[PDB]
Design a protein around this ligand. Sequence first.
Ligand SMILES: [Mg+2]
Ligand SMILES: [Mg+2]
Lengths: 221, 221, 6, 6
Amino acid sequence: MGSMERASLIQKAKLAEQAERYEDMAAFMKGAVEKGEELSCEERNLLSVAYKNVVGGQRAAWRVLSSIEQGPEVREYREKVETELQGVCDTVLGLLDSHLIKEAGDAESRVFYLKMKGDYYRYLAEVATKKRIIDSARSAYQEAMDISKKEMPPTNPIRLGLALNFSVFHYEIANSPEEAISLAKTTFDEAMADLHTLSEDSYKDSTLIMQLLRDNLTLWT
Amino acid sequence: MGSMERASLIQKAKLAEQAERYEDMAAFMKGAVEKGEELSCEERNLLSVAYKNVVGGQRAAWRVLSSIEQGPEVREYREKVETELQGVCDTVLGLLDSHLIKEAGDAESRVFYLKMKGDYYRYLAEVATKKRIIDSARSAYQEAMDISKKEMPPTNPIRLGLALNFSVFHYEIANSPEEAISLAKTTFDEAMADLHTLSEDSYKDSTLIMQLLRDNLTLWT
Amino acid sequence: FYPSAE
Amino acid sequence: FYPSAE
Ligand SMILES: [Mg+2]
Ligand SMILES: [Mg+2]
């Protein structure tokens, strides 16, 4: 993508999203990041949707194959999909480390990128067989939590999605279901108390993510 | 795939189908065809499911992008997807021509492959801007029809799916809606009259495809 | 537009 | 298993 204009990459990412061509969408957004300029809010969302969909298909496939696994063919093919998943997570982590996080000074950008760092170390942990990868996810989520608590209101959708994902990290990855349940409860309750401050459209944005926290609390208790 | 055993390719195609990894499934089945042995019935179905899903995602994307098209970016990206679709159709046509069709002597195999040849020329025609490609689809479907009428009963599922697809070719590609409607009606009626010959399981197989013929007749009349 | 064979 | 953020 080095020969393509930044604006054309961004335009084609949006076309690829409409076409449900998520591998193309992630390749266009990788090329836009590698132009070296910081991303706007809408561009950071495009980067995240593209990779979420790519890695989401790889995670689903890896879970089907790992279940069948429980000749060498099932293990070889699960290994094949696992390696490709690890490569996509390494690519995202590499964009964050060169140089999205270091250039991100506003809280909205910095928390978004540190949450992504946590997420893609978490996806590495889901397949790992591990301590160091779990620690790297934890450390990224904790830095993002610290900034979000100081800099954003409790209803901010990035803060809420970070706390949701850190709660899933604690329940599924770190074997800390009580920490998961405490974080999801505290986050839901502090957001409920701040909803009165919001417009109708912001209220809809924040209550949609709060419902996910509640859906997990209903699964966990 | 040259270093992988045929049986391991077939096993991994089946794993890829379970995992909804259709590009991998088609690459495994391409490697199995290129071993040079004829395919069994279940292997021919694996080849067709894999490519149908790959090309089906490309057709859907091409339709979204062609609709948006109605700077150079929308046309460039529609061209990008179109070229990749044409490459998948060329790959399938190339497997059929080297050497699946020439080695196929039983009617079940030969009609299946000639129907596939018709189908993938039809997908080329959907994007073409053309006469020669439409003629190549027609010629492949007509050879398959001629064999199927002589060699298979009117309820045979390959015969029914060929007549369904040749009817869609006439309505959507060749601008012959009356030929489409006549073929779908005649095929439905001749199959209905032969259902009494079938087991319960064959009856279910044939009536499911007859319902597609009826669904198109309801759209077309 | 028009369903084809599975 | 447990829904994460959109
Ligand atoms: Mg900055
Ligand atoms: Mg033969």
